[PDB]
Design a protein around this ligand. Structure first.
Ligand SMILES: CC(C)CN(CCNCCN(CC(C)C)S(=O)(=O)c1ccc(N)cc1)S(=O)(=O)c1ccc(N)cc1
Ligand SMILES: [Cl-]
Ligand SMILES: [Cl-]
Lengths: 99, 99
């Protein structure tokens, strides 16, 4: 599709059998979601910027569906104020910026 | 242009006669720049970041060029990790997300 930026570009994702709303964020290196369970190994990470840093758990090789697009990648999990889809997954669905 | 996301979408902007590098950030509602001098009066604004809310300076109707595309809009100034171009100016230059 073609997504306008007049409004926040929010999309439905499916992960861990869960449906969630998330922000497509070209400025985010990696996907980070609010607290949830994910299977497999993880390692701690600090991510931050405006207003500071937050501690997250990094899970790798996680399956996700974005707008019906299937993709695999890293998912960070922690106290983000909003669910964000980062470049690491945006590239796999072939998402680009255009003007 | 068409910008893929395998690397950060960092572009050149021009503001106050000076070139700067900035991040095209669809996750950002508003544009926020590193501390700099701008003309006119400013008003206070609180923005919600990944680690918390912070105070920044709002300057309105400022000339800024993004990848050569001319714009005039609101620019916020404050302690941001990088210059960020948000949806207020992305919309202005006709930017969309596509997949
Ligand atoms: C400086 C940016 C490159 C840092 N980030 C990415 C840009 N997101 C842009 C949206 N933001 C809020 C976020 C909670 C949705 S923001 O705090 O940067 C913000 C707020 C207000 C305005 N006007 C401009 C920017 S990050 O969010 O810190 C981040 C860092 C690591 C990962 N893995 C994921 C997100
Ligand atoms: Cl103030
Ligand atoms: Cl504006």
């Amino acid at each position: 599709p073609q997504i306008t930026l007049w409004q926040r570009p929010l999309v439905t994702i499916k992960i861990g059998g869960q449906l969630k709303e998330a922000l497509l964020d070209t400025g985010a290196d990696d996907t980070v979601l609010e607290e949830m369970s994910l299977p497999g190994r993880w390692k701690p990470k600090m991510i931050g910027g405006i207003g500071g840093f937050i501690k997250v758990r990094q899970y790798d090789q996680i399956l996700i569906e974005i707008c019906g697009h299937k993709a695999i990648g890293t998912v960070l999990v922690g106290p983000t104020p909003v669910n964000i889809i980062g470049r690491n997954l945006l590239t796999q669905i072939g998402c680009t910026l255009n003007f």
